[PDB]
């Protein structure tokens, strides 16, 4: 029947990366979550009039299991590479995540989006122009999201699905 897209969230730990998938999958209008529940990471959506199923892998909290990244990444068709806009190191990590995805998928053209996440009210240290320039150098979209207001969350995931569809 409907297409299923296997999406993988990657990025530095400790800076609110998990808020992206939680806010998407959530009861949008009740701030609650049980991640242990069978299919707390599957969501049926309509993108450009076409109904599909998103299966989202977010291993947030397992970042120290660095030798498992290849295995987790190989499950994915498209990738959200996430950094925090108040953590320059997480932004500098993006290049190596992208290189690792390309190696695991054995392709120079893997569907992916760059996501800049605002996880608190601490001062921004990565300006949007810096992130736009990086995304353009890679040929991929850039989306900014709020970890608190759900702004940008749908755009990040739907943009990635469009990258898969247009690959």
């Amino acid at each position: 029947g409907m297409t299923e897209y296997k999406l993988v969230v990657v990025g530095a730990g400790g800076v609110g990366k998990s808020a992206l998938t939680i806010q998407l999958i959530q009861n949008h209008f009740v701030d609650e979550y049980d991640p242990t529940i069978e299919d707390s990471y599957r969501k049926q959506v309509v993108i450009d009039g076409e109904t599909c199923l998103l299966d989202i892998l977010d291993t947030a909290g397992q970042e120290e299991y660095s030798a498992m990244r290849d295995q987790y990444m190989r499950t994915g068709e498209g990738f959200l590479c996430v950094f925090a806009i108040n953590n320059t190191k997480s932004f500098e990590d993006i290049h190596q995540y992208r290189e690792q995805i390309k190696r695991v998928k054995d392709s120079d053209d893997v569907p992916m989006v760059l996501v800049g996440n605002k996880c608190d009210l601490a001062a921004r240290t990565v300006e949007s122009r810096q992130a736009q320039d990086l995304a353009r150098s890679y040929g991929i979209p850039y989306i900014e999201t709020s970890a608190k207001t759900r702004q940008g969350v749908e755009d990040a995931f739907y943009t990635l699905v469009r990258e898969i569809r247009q690959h």
């Binding site: 400790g14 909290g61 498992m68 290849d70």
Partner: protein, 469 residues
């Protein structure tokens, strides 16, 4: 009728329940949210004990109450005023008779003594199972010693004297089995000859057993203090989560060692023997319920350097292909088959910790600290219960010890394994991938031949155990 209570003006824990101070989930009640006063009241309730609640509360309370404040509140809970004589008592005394004091005696028996004993049970669990609060705050320990050591009256005396001794023992701080452990197995390397120890020269049964003992010990050492508040992800993770990080770093090192053993074996026939031996180790891990070990192997086989070695995996026997495939399928569909298998086996086992970490983190991040109701902010206790359900599952698998004998030299060999050497991570994993490209080049480059590197027999002794008299 119900017992009358002290005035809420002299004893705060007698305020009536309302939706402004406590909310229950839809046969003891389950609390969704409440003020800290109401949580402590129900933690030490006169009508029933709730040992699960005590563990949940003591595991998670620091997200809403400081340790010093918790101690002040339970001391306040303990100090319950007794009621005044009733009219019937008054009349007896006016006649020079002894009053019956029926209401006073009932209140002592059915309110004061149960509440006070349940306060002491909180203190006992706090000292026995959450002693880190006192290790980190010497003044908190002094206050607890002073409180316990000044409780008067004979009804509590046995437990006060016991808790005093438990505290003193904790300040200065053995397994029996249903059978003997099996005999340690040896292959090419012989006992005491640590210089020859390696993947193919140790017995694969004994590699799996000694790694299982090591990984079980690492799993059993992780305390809930390393997990609550997601502290293993934060800037002070090395201070707050050292046993968890040691466990993860062991797992990572073994995975990388398996990868390094594979890609540094350039001769195809020898590399097939290396991969086959690692799959036999995986088979023994499965037999031992060491799921951490199973996934260490699966992660290595799915790494970028190893996964692409089609010429190597083509020669692996079909049965071993099936063992590796079954193990890989444990992780598919968000670990569906792993979760079902863990919940079906007979312990001892070594769980994979990563799933617990993701579930604790997402529970913390996806639920609010407080619920706002009728202008009041109530502690969201359901969120803390969910975290403590996960830490409780972790602890349940930490109890059962393996009936296997330690081999000190093999244990030391695996403790000292350091496949990366002095190299940084990127430099090392690029090295492994470049070795993979050297030994099996990308099509259409031809497959080269390489000389053998091992001078000893490659034939495995197998993974069925032997038993001399």
């Amino acid at each position: 009728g119900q017992m009358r209570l002290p005035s809420a003006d002299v004893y705060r824990f007698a305020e009536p329940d309302s939706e402004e101070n406590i909310i229950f989930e839809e046969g003891i009640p389950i609390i969704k949210a409440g003020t800290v006063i109401k949580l402590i009241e129900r933690l030490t309730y006169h009508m029933y004990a709730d040992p699960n609640f005590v563990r949940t509360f003591l595991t998670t309370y620091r997200s809403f109450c400081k340790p010093q404040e918790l101690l002040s509140l339970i001391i306040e809970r303990f100090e319950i005023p007794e009621p005044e004589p009733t009219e019937a008592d008054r009349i007896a005394i006016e006649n020079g008779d002894q009053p019956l004091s029926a209401e006073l005696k009932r209140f002592r028996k059915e309110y004061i003594q149960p509440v006070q004993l349940r306060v002491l049970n909180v203190c006992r669990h706090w000292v026995e199972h959450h002693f880190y609060d006192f290790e980190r705050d010497a003044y908190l320990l002094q206050r607890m010693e002073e409180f316990i050591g000044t409780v008067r009256g004979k009804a509590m005396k046995k437990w006060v004297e016991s808790i005093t001794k438990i505290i003193q023992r904790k300040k200065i701080a053995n397994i029996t089995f249903q059978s003997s452990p099996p005999t340690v197995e040896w292959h090419i390397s012989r006992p005491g000859h640590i210089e020859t120890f390696d993947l193919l020269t140790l017995h694969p049964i004994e590699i799996a057993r000694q790694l299982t003992l090591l990984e079980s010990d690492l799993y059993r050492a992780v305390q809930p203090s390393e997990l609550v508040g997601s502290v293993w992800t934060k800037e002070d993770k090395e201070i707050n989560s050292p046993n968890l990080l040691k466990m993860i770093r062991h797992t990572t090192n073994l995975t990388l060692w398996f990868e390094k053993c594979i890609v540094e074996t350039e001769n195809l026939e020898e590399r097939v023997a290396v991969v086959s031996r690692i799959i036999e180790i995986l088979q023994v891990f499965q037999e031992l319920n060491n799921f951490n070990g199973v996934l260490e192997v699966v992660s290595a086989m799915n790494s970028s350097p190893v996964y692409r070695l089609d010429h190597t995996f083509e020669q692996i026997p079909s049965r071993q292909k099936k063992i590796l495939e079954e193990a890989h399928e444990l992780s598919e569909d968000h670990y569906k088959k792993y979760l079902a298998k863990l919940r079906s086996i007979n312990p001892p086992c070594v769980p994979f910790f990563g799933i617990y970490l993701t579930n604790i983190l997402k529970t913390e991040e996806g639920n609010p600290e407080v619920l706002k109701r009728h202008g009041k902010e109530l502690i969201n206790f359901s969120k803390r219960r969910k975290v403590a359900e996960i830490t409780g599952e972790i602890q349940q698998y930490q109890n059962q010890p393996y009936c296997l004998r330690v081999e000190s030299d093999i244990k030391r060999f695996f403790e000292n394994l350091n496949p990366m050497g002095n190299s940084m991570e990127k430099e090392f994993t690029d090295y492994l991938f470049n070795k993979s490209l050297e030994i099996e080049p990308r099509n259409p480059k031809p497959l080269p031949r390489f000389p053998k590197k091992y001078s000893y027999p490659l034939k495995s002794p197998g993974v069925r155990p032997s038993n001399p008299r």
